[PDB]
Write a protein that binds this ligand. Structure first.
Ligand code: SF4
Ligand code: SF4
Ligand code: FES
Ligand code: FES
Ligand code: FE
Ligand code: FE
Ligand code: FE
Ligand code: FE
Ligand code: FE
Ligand code: FE
Ligand code: FE
Ligand code: FE
Ligand code: FE
Ligand code: FE
Ligand code: FE
Ligand code: FE
Lengths: 633, 633
């Protein structure tokens, strides 16, 4: 089972699923092998009904699609569509929050409000929205309107790109025509240009993809901005992670998906129904997190994270998961069938994301509190049904310090230098105590033993004094293996990094250091890392492609991860991906994405499936940036 | 070669390509066989990097995608993405025209203007835009603004849906949640909901697809509206079609693609450079059409159609095609490589549609006349280079009467009844002289001998007194086989249909009848057939799903055709498709699309690859509608 997951709780539940005959994601993967080599390399096209077309990676015919589409075109078109689909997910999440904020301040949804007035005003300032002499509800209405306007063409480009990157970066991107005109506009243009008989030049196609990836970044940054206004900007918080945060004697309710518009309300409402649960025989309602919706409520409320990504079914296998509350994205639809065997009540809540066999609750912000109590009652009902059943909850959990929004990191740093808070970080980059910064992002992937790349790479970078930040299921992997527990700093961190985390932790009234890895939040909160890096760039007066900052989508899976990886490259970062994206069937495309793009944006992909090699390549990229700045390394 | 194309000109050029060693679309098809059965049935998914996932149509594992996605989900998700891609193409075309109109009336592009003032005012009226006391430029500015606003969410739904269908149809669609909120909004929502771990209920997915197909219809109808304002509403015109419209002693220039924003200007400008060509040794500039951009200038200017769809490469094989001027959609990228062997200058003009090896001219409406003269000079240059080369132009062409916009059909009918022009048509439906109406739409497809389904089906329907209208490459097929020549009415048409076409033709000062098939224009001009059918519905006081009207995408290929077929079903029509869409891998999805959808929209797909059987099924559908109206049949 350690070939399937490096997480010991997951291994224990894999043994249980096996003896109970419950099929898992790993079983369905084994049943899918050998996978199709045309698809894996990108050399398959189904964009018209003359297809499917395939191209032999090597050998004889077929060498070209039926319409004349070359390997280069087919691979670039497929990649572009994955970027657009990712942009559609992150920006659909952000669009939903924009409508939620508008509803809140127009009086149409009392469960929602402006919780972070400071963030609201700073966003308005960044966008050029006048605040002086405005009431907060009118400022927020203007902010929501601007958010919705970035989805279509207008007299300005997408402001959630142009106002969040350094002007010098915006200038480089505009010179290449890469600034998106509108988020949904770019998504539609990708779908058009990649349809049959349209764009058929790999470089032209890929430039479109980079522009669409910046539409994805805009949606991520919008999502983070709006969720912080509505639900509060995260600050440092202490909690726990892994299956051992389930409790047999409580009603265990997982919030799973990406958009916390409802799961933030579920958190609040569950706290008040602690007595309706006590009357059903439970100690209380135990809300736990899965995937990014879990990250959102972990970052803001300290809700413990139960599990992530590829292992999400295992939470159910314990027998203790009374309800799983779903919004959208990264939910294995197998959960609706596994629930028949584990007793979990699986509940969908979003109109465009239903699963056959799952109960559906038509959530509306106008009715959020009522929907939440309806769902929590089903959970309580489900707890009642398992009175006297034995559960197998692995008694395995880690301590997690998290909540490191960019505002929180700057505040923590300000305790070492109140009026120039980035300077202590830059000072230690310069003197070598911090070699560089690496962002771990993305998903787990059944092809990679769960968490093996994240932890292998993180370990090598940390010993080399790299400051590691993480989001999404990269943060989930690292938290479940103890990388967010400050007690592990001595074991994990080089002496220079230890000294810096210790200095900052002690200065913030903490028993000791910051944790080994800084959890910056959900997948849309990759935007927070952009905020941090853009702020460092502006403090140093250089562009992002001169900073010793890298990114690693160490076990990527979702179209969203392809979009993120692509905008990481577009804003100027060396960007590792530890699973094969479907590009190797075209050497020209691969050479653009791993080399020539350097000359356009300064970033570039590092495709490397061996995690020790990937760490060495990420270190070399960091050290090359250091040398470009004239710094020792 | 008759196994490849039923067009004798195409056969002759296929012989030439063979002896010259030029690879064609049919050669690349033969090299692709046997095609992948997972893809053909829809049982393949590459929506995340755990894939590719396939599902065996029958047998043992794999039975389910790695994430748990069932055959039903995978097939519905793939279909939805094809609908969204089609919507992206038609609506990108319309969006471009909207920006063109706005530029024209804001003084920023003198080559463009309001040519059809009557159409402008009627559109404004339909949309609720006040005209009384407005100048035309301000009305048109408002119309263009409304067009652009339909691409995003706003306080109204998409008006180019809700103002173009009968209120009773709009009510049925709203009751099922099928009215699109915004064109690019729906495209993005499809891409989101079909991404990994989101929507996983076949019925929910397919309802999303029907809504997105109405976003496609809106883009088609917008495109037709705006092109008519800018370039004129078509009226009956006489011209010719097939390769014999090439002339060895002229500069032959093909306009190819879909959006005529530039090719309409090329038509005008070529007429004035007739003397610059004469000085290079040519008789003049001979502009000819390929595919839908060709249909646009055929409908408006009588430009002869050279060829269509699957056989587009054959125009080049003659050796006489000096230039091929490309915008986007349905262009085989092989043309850029075949040009090296035929001497044709292939020119791209749209920034998001380039082809490696083709010359690119950065067309801007602000510079249209200058771009056109630049391109026509390259063509003249190319004619000079083939002084004294022999060409092989098959001496094969047909006579084509076309230009049957809905306005033109109503006007033609008005000569039989001035104040109730639809009544003569309805009278003859009721008395059986017209059994029903069939719209032929869509592409050719290399899998089907070129034109065989269009002509086989058309022949049977016409002998049974069906009024046949056609668009796009369905119109192209029928024109090249003589179905738009009124001299063939006696051979092709039943006595009742003949009597009606004769009555109308004679009443419109014509030597004789209307042609056997009414050419209603390009692919976006499928919207014209909707206008006609909606007008008939409103005159009778019934909804479209009670009218004896059917549609046939007899040889479909492009994602656009899937979108059209789907909105034909959604607005209430029995809709034949003569190639297999990728749905047969899921019986539940197939049963929804061919049966249960009847109960939602009244329309339904008829999947039938044998054209004689398909004609029988279309006749049965027409006759069932007749019986529902209480009419003989
Ligand atoms: S778009 Fe071209 S390569 Fe793709 S399926 Fe169609 S014919 Fe094949
Ligand atoms: S979305 Fe599901 S079915 Fe599709 S490739 Fe990924 S794991 Fe396979
Ligand atoms: S041939 Fe397998 S992915 Fe298409
Ligand atoms: S397995 Fe062939 S289309 Fe994917
Ligand atoms: Fe995740
Ligand atoms: Fe996530
Ligand atoms: Fe993620
Ligand atoms: Fe992910
Ligand atoms: Fe994910
Ligand atoms: Fe993610
Ligand atoms: Fe066509
Ligand atoms: Fe067409
Ligand atoms: Fe067509
Ligand atoms: Fe077509
Ligand atoms: Fe076409
Ligand atoms: Fe078409």
């Amino acid at each position: 089972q350690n070939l399937k997951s490096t997480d010991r709780a997951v291994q224990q539940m894999l043994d249980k699923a096996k003896r109970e005959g419950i099929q898992t994601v790993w079983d369905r993967y084994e049943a899918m092998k050998p996978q199709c080599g045309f698809g894996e390399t990108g050399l398959c096209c189904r964009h018209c009904l003359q297809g499917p077309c395939r191209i032999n990676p090597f050998g004889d015919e077929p060498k070209v699609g039926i319409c004349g589409a070359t390997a280069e075109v087919i691979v670039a078109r497929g990649l572009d569509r994955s970027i657009a689909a990712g942009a559609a997910g992150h920006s659909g999440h952000a669009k939903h929050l924009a409508h939620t904020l508008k509803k809140a301040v127009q009086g149409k949804a009392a469960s929602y409000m402006i919780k972070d007035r400071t963030k609201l005003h700073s966003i308005a300032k960044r966008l050029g929205i006048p605040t002086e002499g405005q009431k907060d509800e009118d400022i927020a209405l203007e902010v929501a309107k601007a958010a919705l306007a970035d989805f279509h063409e207008k007299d300005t480009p997408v402001l959630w790109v142009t106002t969040v990157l350094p002007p010098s970066r915006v200038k480089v991107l505009s010179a290449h025509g890469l600034i998106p005109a509108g988020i949904d506009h770019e998504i539609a243009e990708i779908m058009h240009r990649t349809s049959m008989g349209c764009d058929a030049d790999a470089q032209n196609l890929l430039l479109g993809g980079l522009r669409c990836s910046l539409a994805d970044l805009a949606g991520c940054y919008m999502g983070t901005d709006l969720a912080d206004i509505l639900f509060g900007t995260p600050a440092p918080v202490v909690t726990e992670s892994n299956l051992g945060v389930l409790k047999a004697d409580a009603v265990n309710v997982a919030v799973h998906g990406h958009n916390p518009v409802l799961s933030d309300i579920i958190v609040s409402v569950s706290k008040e129904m602690e007595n309706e649960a006590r009357a059903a025989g439970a100690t209380g309602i135990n809300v736990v997190g899965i995937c990014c919706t879990g990250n959102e409520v972990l970052m803001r409320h300290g809700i413990p994270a139960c599990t992530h990504s590829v292992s999400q079914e295992m939470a159910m296998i314990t027998g203790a998961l009374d309800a799983m509350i779903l919004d959208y994205q990264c939910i294995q639809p197998s959960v609706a069938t596994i629930a028949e065997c584990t007793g979990t009540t699986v509940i969908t809540t979003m109109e465009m994301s239903k699963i056959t066999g799952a109960t559906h609750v038509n959530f509306a912000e106008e009715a959020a509190v009522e929907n939440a109590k309806q769902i929590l009652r089903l959970a309580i009902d489900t707890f009642k049904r398992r009175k006297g059943k034995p559960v197998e909850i692995p008694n395995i959990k880690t301590k997690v310090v998290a909540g490191f929004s960019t505002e929180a990191i700057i505040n923590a740093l300000s305790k070492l230098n109140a009026n120039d808070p980035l300077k202590p970080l830059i000072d230690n980059v310069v003197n070598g105590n911090i070699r560089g910064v690496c962002l771990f992002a993305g998903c787990n992937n059944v092809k990679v033993p769960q968490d093996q790349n994240f932890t292998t790479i993180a370990r090598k970078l940390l010993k080399q004094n790299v400051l590691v930040v993480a989001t999404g299921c990269g943060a989930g992997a690292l938290m479940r293996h103890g990388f967010m527990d400050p007690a592990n700093v001595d074991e994990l961190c080089g002496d220079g990094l230890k000294a810096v985390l210790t200095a900052i932790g002690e200065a913030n009234g903490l028993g000791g250091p910051l944790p080994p890895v800084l959890h910056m939040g959900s997948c849309v909160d990759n935007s927070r890392a952009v905020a941090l890096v853009a702020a460092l760039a502006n403090r140093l007066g250089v562009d992002l492609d001169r900073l010793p900052v890298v990114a690693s989508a160490a076990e990527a899976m979702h179209e969203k991860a392809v979009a993120i990886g692509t905008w990481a490259v577009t804003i100027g970062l060396p960007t590792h991906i530890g699973v094969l994206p479907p590009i190797t069937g075209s050497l020209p495309v691969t050479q653009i994405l791993t080399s020539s793009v350097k000359d356009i944006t300064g970033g570039y992909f590092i495709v490397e499936l061996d995690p020790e090699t990937a760490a060495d390549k990420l270190l070399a990229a960091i050290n090359e940036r250091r040398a470009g700045l004239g710094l020792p390394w």
